[PDB]
Design a protein around this ligand. Structure first.
Ligand SMILES: O=c1nc(Cc2ccccc2)[nH]c2[nH]c3cccc(O)c3c12
Ligand SMILES: [Zn+2]
Length: 114
């Protein structure tokens, strides 16, 4: 392909920063637990269950290192993050429900920015 235009890189960061900075009615930053996954030594149970792990740190690195070739590719990884959160955590639990919100916050951001 062609290198990531500065405008696309700026859009990808603007979208991910909306998700990360997002807060609920209570004043809680939902992304907090999703920024960094615990290590394989800290939580081996998660790595046994989850095939393709990702956190917001890895997504920022993939934006920075021009790994996402479209906003669709970025979406695929944000959707994967949330799916893993929904797979590993019990339905109705805080982490599980926060991931459903962040999925929506991403789509809202994507359509607003792009
Ligand atoms: O599903 C997850 N469960 C926990 C459980 C936990 C909570 C608090 C302290 C220690 C462990 N931490 C997590 N960090 C993430 C990062 C990205 C994606 C994720 O799906 C997760 C994720
Ligand atoms: Zn799956």
């Amino acid at each position: 392909l062609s290198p990531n235009p500065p405008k696309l890189t700026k859009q990808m960061n603007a979208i991910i920063d909306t998700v990360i900075n997002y807060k609920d009615s209570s004043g809680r930053q939902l992304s907090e637990v999703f920024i960094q996954l615990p290590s394989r030594k800290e939580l081996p149970e998660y790595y046994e269950l989850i095939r393709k792990p990702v956190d917001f740190k890895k997504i920022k690195e993939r934006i920075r290192n021009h790994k996402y070739r479209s906003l669709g590719d970025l979406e695929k990884d944000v959707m994967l993050l949330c799916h893993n959160a929904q797979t590993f955590n019990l339905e109705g639990s805080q982490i599980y429900e926060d991931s459903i919100v962040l999925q929506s916050v991403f789509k809202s951001a994507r359509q607003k920015i792009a």
